[PDB]
C-alpha cells in the first residue's frame, strides 16, 4: 500500500549534479540499509546502481552515490552526461518481507543542444493502393527536446482527420524520435495534387510534400 | 549470469498470465531471490513477488497477492509466474530478476540481473498479422517497410537477415483509434548502393506467428 514517493520529474543541466530523492517509511528505508537504486532507459532492462543504500556494483561509475537519512533515500548523480536522462528508481526490502519500487524519477539534462527533427514522408505504396487504401507515412527523428506537433495539408489545406501521430520516444543516441500517420483511402489519396506532412519543432517547422502524380 | 522471459503476450481480461523465466548460468536452487517486477508507463516499475531458490519460500506484493502464484522447476531451472483475473491494469513488461543479498534482515535484497522483459498485453481484442508494404525511396536513400493494423505488440523488424544493422530505424508504433498498430522501419542507404543491394526488411508478428520478408523495390 504505501508507496515510496518520487518527485516525477527533475532536471539539471550539463556537467550539473542532480539529487534525486525517494521519501518511505519507518517499515523499509528506516527499517533497513536496503535501499537500492535503478536506472530504466527506453526498451532496456532497469540497470542497478546503488545497493544497500550506497553500494556500488562493477560497471557503474562513481558518478553515482546514494544514501539514506531517517526514511527518506537519495541518488545523486554528479558530472550529468546526455546518457543520464532516464527514469531513476528507488527500491527497499520492508517489513514483512516485501518489496517496494519508488514510483519513478525521469531525468531531464538540461544545457543539451536543439537537434531539428529529420523528416521523412512516404507516398503510399502501389501495392496498398491495389487495396484501395493509402497511408502516407511521415517518419521524424533525431529531434530534442522530444515536442513536436504534426499537422498535415492536401492541397495547402490543413487536413482534419485521418491522423495518427506517435508520442517522441528516445533514440539510443539520446535523442527523440516520432511518426505520423495519414490514413486515405485510394480515391482520396487521388482527389488532391498533393499532401504534405507538417512538422513543428521549438518554433520552426520542417514540411515535406508528395504528389499523386 | 542470464535470465530470459517467455510466455504469450497477448492475455484476455479475467483470464491468466502465465509467464516463465529460463535462468541460465546458475542454478535456481541457489541462495538467491529469483523475483517478478514489471514495468508500464502507468506504474513504473512494480515488484510482483519473489521465490527463495534454497528453500522455496514465496513473498508477494499485498496489492495483487490475491491472485499470484510463484514457482520454480529446479529440474529445468526456470521461474514461473501466474497472475490471474488479470485486466488492462496488468498490460505491462514483465521482468525476471535475481536478487542479491548479504544479510536480508539488515541489508534488505536487491536485483542485479535482469532478463531482457517480456510485453504481455491484457485485451479482448484479437491478434491481427500487420499488412507489410515497402516505402520506395538523393545522396542518401531512406527505403523501408510499413508494418500496417497489426495487434498486438511487439513486431521486431530486421533487415536483409540481420546483415544490415547500420542506419537502421524501427519506430515505436502507433495506436489507431481501430485499436490496431503500425509502425515503419526505415534503412537509411547511400543511394548508390540501391543498383547493387537488394533491401529486405523482415518482419515478425509473433503473436501472429507471422514473417514476412519484403523485398523493398525502386519503383516504376
Known amino acids: 500500500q504505501s508507496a515510496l514517493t518520487q518527485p516525477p520529474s527533475v532536471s539539471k543541466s550539463l556537467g550539473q549534479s542532480v539529487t534525486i530523492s525517494c521519501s518511505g517509511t519507518?517499515?523499509?528505508?528506516?527499517?533497513?540499509?536496503?535501499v537500492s537504486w535503478y536506472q530504466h532507459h527506453s526498451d532496456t532492462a532497469p540497470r542497478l546502481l546503488i545497493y544497500?543504500?550506497?553500494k556500488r556494483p562493477s560497471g557503474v561509475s562513481d558518478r553515482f552515490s546514494g544514501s539514506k537519512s531517517g526514511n527518506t533515500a537519495s541518488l545523486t548523480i554528479s558530472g550529468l552526461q546526455a546518457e543520464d536522462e532516464a527514469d531513476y528508481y528507488c527500491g527497499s526490502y520492508r517489513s514483512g518481507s516485501t518489496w517496494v519500487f519508488g514510483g519513478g524519477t525521469r531525468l531531464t539534462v538540461l544545457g543539451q543542444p536543439k537537434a531539428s527533427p529529420t523528416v521523412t514522408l512516404f507516398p503510399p505504396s502501389s501495392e496498398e493502393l491495389q487495396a484501395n487504401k493509402a497511408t502516407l507515412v511521415c517518419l521524424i527523428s533525431d529531434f530534442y527536446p522530444g515536442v513536436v506537433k504534426v499537422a498535415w495539408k492536401a492541397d495547402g489545406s490543413a487536413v482534419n482527420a485521418g491522423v495518427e501521430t506517435t508520442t517522441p520516444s528516445k533514440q539510443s543516441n539520446n535523442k527523440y524520435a516520432a511518426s505520423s500517420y495519414l490514413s486515405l483511402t485510394s480515391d482520396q489519396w487521388k482527389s488532391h495534387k498533393s499532401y504534405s506532412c507538417q512538422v513543428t519543432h521549438e518554433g520552426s517547422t520542417v514540411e515535406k510534400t508528395v504528389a499523386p502524380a | 549470469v542470464q535470465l530470459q522471459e517467455s510466455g504469450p503476450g497477448l492475455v484476455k481480461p479475467s483470464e491468466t498470465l502465465s509467464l516463465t523465466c529460463a535462468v541460465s548460468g546458475g542454478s535456481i536452487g541457489d541462495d538467491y531471490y529469483w523475483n517478478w517486477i514489471r514495468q508500464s508507463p502507468g506504474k513504473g516499475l512494480e515488484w510482483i513477488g519473489s521465490?527463495?531458490?534454497?528453500?522455496?519460500?514465496?513473498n508477494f506484493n499485498p496489492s495483487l497477492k490475491n491472485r499470484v502464484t510463484i514457482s520454480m522447476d529446479t529440474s529445468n531451472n526456470q521461474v514461473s509466474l501466474k497472475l490471474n483475473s488479470v485486466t488492462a491494469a496488468d498490460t505491462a513488461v514483465y521482468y525476471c530478476?535475481?536478487?542479491?543479498?548479504?544479510?536480508?534482515?539488515?541489508?534488505?535484497?536487491?536485483?542485479?540481473?535482469w532478463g531482457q522483459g517480456v510485453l504481455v498485453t491484457v485485451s479482448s481484442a484479437s491478434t491481427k498479422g500487420p499488412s507489410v508494404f515497402p516505402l520506395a525511396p538523393e545522396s542518401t536513400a531512406a527505403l523501408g517497410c510499413l508494418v500496417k493494423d497489426y495487434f498486438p505488440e511487439p513486431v521486431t523488424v530486421s533487415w536483409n537477415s540481420g546483415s544490415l544493422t547500420s542506419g537502421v530505424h524501427t519506430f515505436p508504433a502507433v495506436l489507431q483509434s481501430s485499436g490496431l498498430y503500425s509502425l515503419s522501419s526505415v534503412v537509411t542507404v547511400p543511394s548508390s548502393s540501391l543498383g547493387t543491394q537488394t533491401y529486405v526488411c523482415n518482419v515478425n508478428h509473433k503473436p501472429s506467428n507471422t514473417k514476412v520478408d519484403k523485398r523493398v523495390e525502386i519503383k516504376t
Open positions: 519507518t517499515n523499509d528505508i528506516g527499517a533497513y540499509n536496503g
Open positions: 521465490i527463495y531458490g534454497s528453500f522455496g519460500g514465496t
Open positions: 544497500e543504500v550506497n
Open positions: 530478476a535475481r536478487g542479491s543479498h548479504s544479510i536480508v534482515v539488515l541489508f534488505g535484497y536487491y536485483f542485479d540481473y
